[PDB]
Design an enzyme around this catalytic site. Structure first.
Site, short mmCIF file in Angstrom:
data_model
loop_
_atom_site.label_atom_id
_atom_site.label_comp_id
_atom_site.label_asym_id
_atom_site.label_seq_id
_atom_site.Cartn_x
_atom_site.Cartn_y
_atom_site.Cartn_z
N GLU A 22 0.83 -1.20 0.00
CA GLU A 22 0.00 0.00 0.00
C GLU A 22 0.87 1.26 0.00
O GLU A 22 0.53 2.26 -0.64
CB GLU A 22 -0.95 -0.02 1.20
CG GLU A 22 -2.04 1.07 1.17
CD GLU A 22 -2.91 1.08 2.43
OE1 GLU A 22 -3.11 0.00 3.01
OE2 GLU A 22 -3.40 2.16 2.82
N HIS A 23 2.00 1.22 0.71
CA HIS A 23 2.91 2.36 0.71
C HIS A 23 3.63 2.55 -0.61
O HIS A 23 4.17 3.63 -0.85
CB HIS A 23 3.96 2.22 1.81
CG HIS A 23 3.48 2.62 3.17
ND1 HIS A 23 2.36 2.07 3.76
CD2 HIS A 23 3.97 3.52 4.06
CE1 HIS A 23 2.18 2.61 4.95
NE2 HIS A 23 3.14 3.49 5.16
N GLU A 50 4.83 5.09 11.57
CA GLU A 50 3.39 4.89 11.72
C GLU A 50 3.08 3.92 12.86
O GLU A 50 2.07 4.08 13.55
CB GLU A 50 2.80 4.39 10.40
CG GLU A 50 2.76 5.45 9.31
CD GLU A 50 2.30 4.91 7.96
OE1 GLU A 50 2.05 3.69 7.86
OE2 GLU A 50 2.14 5.71 7.01
#
Ligand SMILES: CCCCCCCCCCCCCCCCCC(=O)OC[C@H](COP(=O)([O-])OCC(O)COP(=O)([O-])OC[C@@H](COC(=O)CCCCCCCCCCCCCCCCC)OC(=O)CCCCCCCCCCCCCCCCC)OC(=O)CCCCCCCCCCCCCCCCC
Ligand SMILES: CCCCCCCCCCCCCC(=O)OC[C@H](COP(=O)(O)OCC[N+](C)(C)C)OC(=O)CCCCCCCCCCCCC
Ligand SMILES: CCCCCC(=O)OC[C@H](COP(=O)([O-])OCCN)OC(=O)CCCCC
Ligand SMILES: CCCCCC(=O)OC[C@H](COP(=O)([O-])OCCN)OC(=O)CCCCC
Lengths: 49, 34, 105, 425, 446, 61, 49
Positions: free
Chosen positions: E60-61, E137
């Site tokens: 996703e990153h 994160e």
């Protein structure tokens, strides 16, 4: 870093039915409760007598 | 639930540059409900 | 409507003086029994009426301790007795009955 | 073929008493009705500050037609919703429900807005909610800054906060709520909008129950822009700062130029965890600032004024660098360094953003209610894109010129040891 | 005039088509200038092993960081330039990438999605830069007690199984996930019969199918010989995890019993029961007059700052329960009132409150599918879980079937005398003992 | 008997507390009759000659 | 005390009548068992001794 936390393995404590990760606990849900609540009911019967 | 929108309990922390984008305000509004 | 009405009111004024709470300076609403409806109505009273209620009851308890009454001039006149609490209590009761009617459906 | 039917177009009516009704039958399973009122915090004065906040929190208090218990249980019984949204200019009483229960919730809405009792004890028990409600909002640092930014910018009206000043918590009286409703919740100050409602029903309701006279004139006293700075030293991890100038009243052509300038400078992100390549403010700051930060153009337009500028978040030591880099980037635009592909992309972001803001019933209803009070009309989307297309590049440059040369207003919170004053910019 | 029932017939049918490679293409046409279109993939951390548990989140990153055709920020510039918005998310069972854009830009939006899900260039220089981002994160997520306590609930409830894993993965995995781990993940899960090209807005289903055969025909629909991943059932475990940390000002508690899954008809009745219990926040206006006994009691006695009920569904399993936040001297009362309501609904559910829950769910269903993006998500996700789009008229039929008896029978099946999973975080000294919690799951009077 | 024995006892008798109590009171009734019957038969077998009820036949009248 | 006469209260009573019936069987059997009530126990099959 809280994602580094995993629950340890209880395999040397669990009952036989609930040791399979790929098997539902609903299967033995019925039997496990009855075994433990049977012991309670018998105890009350002995106390009752 | 009570709202405060302005973009056009310890809450949390913002550390990196990726998680700061969208936070800068861009005219406040206040909303209440049941 | 004087003939029949004044005889009923005449018997009520008789009972009012017979009850005798006016002899301690009290009003009728000062003597009501505090249930949950009455505690809420008292809570809703404005500052002045609450403070007046407190002192009259305090003055009556002081008299009751001494087994005394006020002089006759200071008795609560039947015509001047203000039912200051009744309108608040009526609303509190009306609200509770609404809750109860909703609890039935 | 799952082709949908032909969409019905909105209907609109101005009654002679000033009230505005606007309905749209979208044949949706749910209905939405909102009463928009020119009663925002601008219409408070120094003697009754916070009265519109407590009023915003009091929609479930007892009315002449519905007890507090009934409003909460009647709406929840049919799964409905009651909300009160408030800006510096408007209060918006909105109600949501399925089609068959609109009659029920309309009656509640009318009682809340036209017949509240503001019972002394109910009001007293609500006063502590001001402290809870304010505290929840003010754990976003953005809420502090923008509230201080308006207090520093204006001498009155728009300087007023959306949240009650602490010294007034517990001091707002039922009389002040009564007086506030009586002279602000009037026909010439109101708009009744309804989605999934017939126009005859709303027109019937408006003429029957929303014919309220008396009160005050429209817009009250004019907002006098001042300029100034408010600084809040609190040692937060990051410094939040906003720097603005007076820009333009909503509804004017100059306001579209500011809106287009906002999307040239960079309003918000379009790609998740993206570098904001086409954001001219972000790249300007990103050059000489390698630490984390955020920067965004700020655009706030009102009936009689506006504020344009930018909002920065940065480390406390980099606050001046981020601010000066952002301000210079606006200067280069005022100096005429603006290409046509830049303004065309900004129009695309703006035009696309507007359409996306009205695809939900909630966002559509707020726009129609806002237009009804601001403009007294409904402007369809195609005409809005037309007005956006009409923005020339020279209009955008001139707006940037107006910001650079205009007297500034600033607000900042954090460790401000390296956050400049206005005269240091 | 028009009624609620008639309005449900006016909802357009969701057209569905499947390409030759197996890619399913679904759309609900509206009369809108905008639209939302995206690809929903049947991939998540439940498919990931302990080695590669952080790969999908890592991908996703990298999804929006460059491709073979549009390297670097070239993709980022095209989306921003046309005013569109690109977004994505990953759960334990589903991954999604979708674009919000003008309806006229649907041909380009579909092209970009195909370029992302097929030709993602996972450059080594970018992989290393996203490494430190994810670790940061993880530090941020540690400060959200809500996100922490719900990951704890999964960790103990599904202990020893893939569902116990978090979506983001452990700190150690992010520092050794290689490019081969990510490409192996992609080439093994991003197959056409597990992807759904969903769209919603102003668009003809014909053009979406054309763009699908145009930009997705170049996709491998032929699985490996015996490398087709199959989800094993995940053992639920009655258990408890208590992270005592008195330095935090409020306790977070999450409790749940095992639910049935996505496709079980009992979810409708369970969602009605959760609507009766509802949710609460200290900023609600109702307070003492709220219908839910838990909510009114919590408001009047200040038992909590918030609570929410939930029914989290997975394949053939799920987490059914509630979560709340409260002062350290209120955990016991909240647990007591919470469990009392579960037992009350199991044994003594009345008809009027059930009509309340039905009405709340009707409003919750209709109010949620309001906009191009929520409808596009309901299209893509429903085709993975249900294998079809369930029209609103069908949900209304299932809700109308529910009466008080159905709630008493359905709730007793999942709540009564069942072992819950408990997750506690914060000042939780007053959190009741597990035996006492377990005893709260039945009534001696019944 | 494909379902487990203990599993069927739980669903029918132990799930509700009311039937869980009824099975106990009914169990104590039938347990009392069988326990005293078996206990007395054991005490009497060890002492077969010694008890009076083993000698009552001599003293007919 | 008229407030307990309503549709909800008669739905509530209907939910609890099976449970109260069974607690009557518990008490009835418990009373017969604890007192060795010959009037009832002569009819039970195996108990007769
Ligand atoms: C001798 C007389 C016995 C008196 C108790 C009778 C039951 C009673 O009063 O009803 C309440 C009690 C409440 O039970 P519930 O349905 O679980 O209600 C939960 C409440 O939320 C209440 O839930 P809770 O979370 O507040 O507590 C559950 C409560 C459940 O237990 C009780 O409430 C029983 C109280 C103890 C009775 C004394 C022992 C004898 O647990 C206890 O208090 C057990 C601790 C006792 C330890 C004593 C040893 C020292 O109801 C029953 O027990 C009814 C069944 C009666 C069976 C009797 C057989 C003949
Ligand atoms: C007119 C005469 C009327 C009398 C009729 C006879 C009544 C017989 C009793 C029937 C009531 C039985 C109810 C009952 O067992 O509940 C109390 C606890 C909880 O049992 P438990 O198995 O832990 O959980 C019950 C869950 N369930 C119902 C879903 C299976 O279960 C127990 O803990 C009971 C067994 C514990 C015995 C020890 C306590 C007695 C005092 C100690 C005496 C020995 C030491 C001196
Ligand atoms: C005539 C009996 C009256 C009932 C007394 C009783 O059983 O106490 C309740 C507990 C079991 O209920 P719980 O602790 O699971 O809580 C269940 C709540 N849902 O039992 C115990 O272990 C307590 C020991 C009592 C012995 C005197
Ligand atoms: C409340 C205290 C009751 C105690 C009365 C008592 O001594 O019980 C003796 C009788 C004996 O049963 P029976 O068949 O000989 O009958 C002989 C008749 N005398 O058992 C009963 O009948 C129990 C009745 C219980 C009613 C509450």
């Amino acid at each position: 870093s809280h994602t580094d936390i995993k629950v340890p393995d209880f395999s040397d404590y669990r009952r036989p039915e609930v040791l399979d990760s790929t098997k539902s606990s609903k299967e033995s849900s019925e039997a496990r409760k009855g075994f433990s609540y049977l012991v309670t009911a018998t105890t009350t019967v002995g106390v009752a007598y | 639930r009570g709202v405060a929108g302005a973009l056009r309990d310890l809450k949390r922390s913002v550390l990196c540059r990726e998680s700061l984008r969208g936070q800068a305000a861009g005219p406040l509004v206040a909303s209440v409900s049941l | 409507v004087s003939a029949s009405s004044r005889w009923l009111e005449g018997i009520r004024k008789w009972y009012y003086n017979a009850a005798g709470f006016n002899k301690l300076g009290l009003m009728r609403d000062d003597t009501i029994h505090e249930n949950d409806d009455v505690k809420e109505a008292i809570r809703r009273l404005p500052e002045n009426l609450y403070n007046d209620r407190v002192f009259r009851i305090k003055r009556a308890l002081d008299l009751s301790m001494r087994q005394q009454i006020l002089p006759k001039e200071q008795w609560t006149k039947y015509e001047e007795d203000k039912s200051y609490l009744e309108p608040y209590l009526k609303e509190v009761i009306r609200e509770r009955k609404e809750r109860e009617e909703w609890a039935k459906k | 073929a799952g082709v949908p039917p032909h969409p019905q177009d909105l209907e609109f009516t101005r009654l002679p008493n000033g009230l505005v009704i606007a309905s749209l039958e979208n044949y949706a399973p749910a209905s939405r009705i909102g009463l928009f009122i020119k009663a925002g915090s601008r219409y408070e004065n120094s003697n009754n500050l916070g009265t519109s906040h407590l009023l915003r929190l009091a929609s479930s208090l007892t009315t002449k037609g519905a007890s507090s218990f009934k409003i909460t249980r009647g709406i929840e019984a049919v799964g409905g919703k009651l909300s009160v949204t408030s800006t510096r200019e408007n209060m918006a009483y909105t109600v949501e429900c399925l089609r068959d229960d609109v009659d029920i919730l309309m009656e509640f809405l009318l009682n809340v807005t036209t017949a509240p009792e503001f019972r002394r004890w109910e009001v007293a028990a609500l006063q502590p909610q001001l402290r809870i409600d304010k505290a929840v909002a003010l754990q976003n640092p953005q809420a502090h800054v923008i509230e201080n930014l308006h207090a520093a910018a204006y001498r009155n009206a728009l300087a007023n906060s959306l949240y009650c000043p602490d010294y007034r918590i517990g001091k707002v009286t039922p009389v002040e709520l009564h007086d506030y409703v009586q002279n602000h919740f009037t026909s010439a100050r109101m708009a009744l909008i309804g989605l999934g409602v017939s126009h005859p029903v709303l027109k019937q309701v408006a003429e029957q129950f929303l014919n309220i006279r008396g009160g005050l004139g429209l817009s009250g006293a004019k907002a006098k822009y001042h300029g100034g700075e408010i600084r809040e030293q609190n040692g937060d991890s990051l410094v939040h700062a906003a720097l603005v100038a007076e820009s333009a009243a909503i509804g004017s052509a100059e306001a579209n130029a500011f809106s287009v300038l906002q999307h040239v400078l960079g309003a918000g992100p379009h790609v998740k965890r993206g570098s904001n390549a086409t954001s001219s403010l972000y790249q300007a700051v990103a050059k000489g600032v390698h630490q984390p930060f955020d920067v965004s153009a700020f655009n706030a337009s009102y009936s009689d004024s506006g504020l344009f500028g930018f909002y920065t978040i940065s480390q406390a030591a980099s606050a001046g660098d981020v601010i000066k880099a952002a301000y210079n980037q606006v200067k280069t635009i005022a100096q005429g360094n603006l290409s046509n592909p830049d303004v065309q992309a900004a129009k695309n972001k703006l035009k696309a953003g507007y359409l996306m803001s009205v695809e939900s019933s909630e966002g559509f209803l707020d726009e129609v209610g806002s237009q009804a009070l601001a403009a007294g009309s409904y402007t369809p989307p195609s005409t809005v894109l037309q007005q956006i297309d009409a923005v020339a590049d020279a209009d955008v440059i001139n707006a940037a010129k107006k910001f650079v040369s205009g007297r500034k207003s600033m607000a900042a919170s954090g460790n401000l040891g390296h956050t400049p004053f206005i005269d240091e910019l | 005039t028009a009624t609620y029932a008639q309005a449900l017939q006016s909802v357009p049918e969701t057209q569905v088509s499947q390409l030759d490679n197996g890619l399913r293409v679904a759309s609900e046409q509206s009369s809108q200038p905008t639209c939302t279109v995206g690809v929903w993939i049947d991939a998540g951390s439940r498919y990931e092993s302990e080695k590669n548990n952080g790969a999908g989140y890592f991908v996703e990153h990298l999804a929006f960081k460059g491709t073979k055709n549009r390297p670097g920020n070239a993709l980022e510039k095209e989306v921003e330039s046309m005013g569109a918005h690109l977004n994505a998310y990953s759960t334990r069972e589903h991954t999604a990438y979708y674009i919000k854009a003008l309806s006229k830009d649907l041909p380009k939006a579909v092209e970009l999605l195909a370029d992302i899900v097929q030709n993602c260039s996972l450059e080594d220089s970018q992989i290393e830069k996203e490494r430190d981002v994810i670790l940061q994160e993880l530090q941020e997520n540690d400060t959200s007690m809500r996100d922490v306590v719900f990951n704890y609930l999964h960790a103990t409830a599904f202990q020893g199984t893939p569902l116990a894993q978090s979506v983001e993965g452990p700190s150690e995995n992010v520092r050794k996930l290689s490019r081969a781990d990510l490409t192996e993940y992609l080439s093994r899960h991003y197959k056409a019969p597990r992807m759904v090209l969903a769209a919603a807005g102003g668009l003809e289903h014909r053009q979406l199918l054309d763009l699908a055969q145009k930009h997705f025909s170049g996709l491998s629909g032929t699985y490996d010989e015996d490398a087709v991943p199959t989800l094993s059932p995940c053992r639920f475990t009655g258990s408890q995890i208590c992270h005592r940390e008195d330095g935090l000002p409020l306790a977070h508690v999450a409790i749940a019993v095992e639910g049935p899954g996505w496709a079980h008809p009992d979810n409708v009745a369970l969602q009605v029961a959760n609507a009766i219990i509802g949710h609460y926040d200290c900023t609600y206006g109702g307070g003492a007059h709220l219908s839910s006994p838990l909510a009114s009691i919590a408001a009047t006695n200040k038992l909590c700052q918030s609570f929410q009920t939930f029914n989290i569904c997975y394949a053939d399993t799920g987490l059914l329960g509630a979560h709340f936040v409260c002062d350290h001297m209120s955990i016991d009362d909240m647990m007591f009132v919470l469990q009392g309501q579960w037992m009350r609904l199991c044994t003594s559910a009345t008809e009027s409150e059930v009509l309340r829950g039905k009405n709340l769910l009707r409003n919750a269903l209709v109010s949620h599918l309001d906009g191009t993006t929520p409808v596009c998500e309901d299209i893509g996700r429903s085709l993975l879980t249900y294998g079809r789009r369930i029209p609103l008229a069908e949900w209304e039929s299932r809700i109308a079937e529910v009466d008080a008896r159905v709630v008493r029978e359905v709730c007793s099946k999942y709540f009564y005398d069942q072992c819950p999973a408990v997750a506690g975080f914060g000042p939780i000294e007053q959190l009741p003992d597990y035996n006492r919690i377990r005893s709260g799951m039945f009534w001696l009077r019944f | 008997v494909a379902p487990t024995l203990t599993a069927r006892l739980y669903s029918l008798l132990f799930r509700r507390t009311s039937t869980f109590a009824l099975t106990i009171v009914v169990g104590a009734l039938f347990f009392e009759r069988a326990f005293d019957q078996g206990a007395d038969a054991i005490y009497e077998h060890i002492n077969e000659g010694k008890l009076w009820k083993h000698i009552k036949h001599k003293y007919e009248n | 005390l008229t407030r307990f006469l309503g549709p909800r209260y008669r739905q509530l009573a209907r939910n609890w009548v099976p449970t109260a019936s069974l607690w009557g069987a518990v008490g009835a059997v418990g009373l017969v068992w604890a007192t060795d009530w010959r009037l009832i126990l002569d009819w039970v099959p195996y108990i007769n001794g």
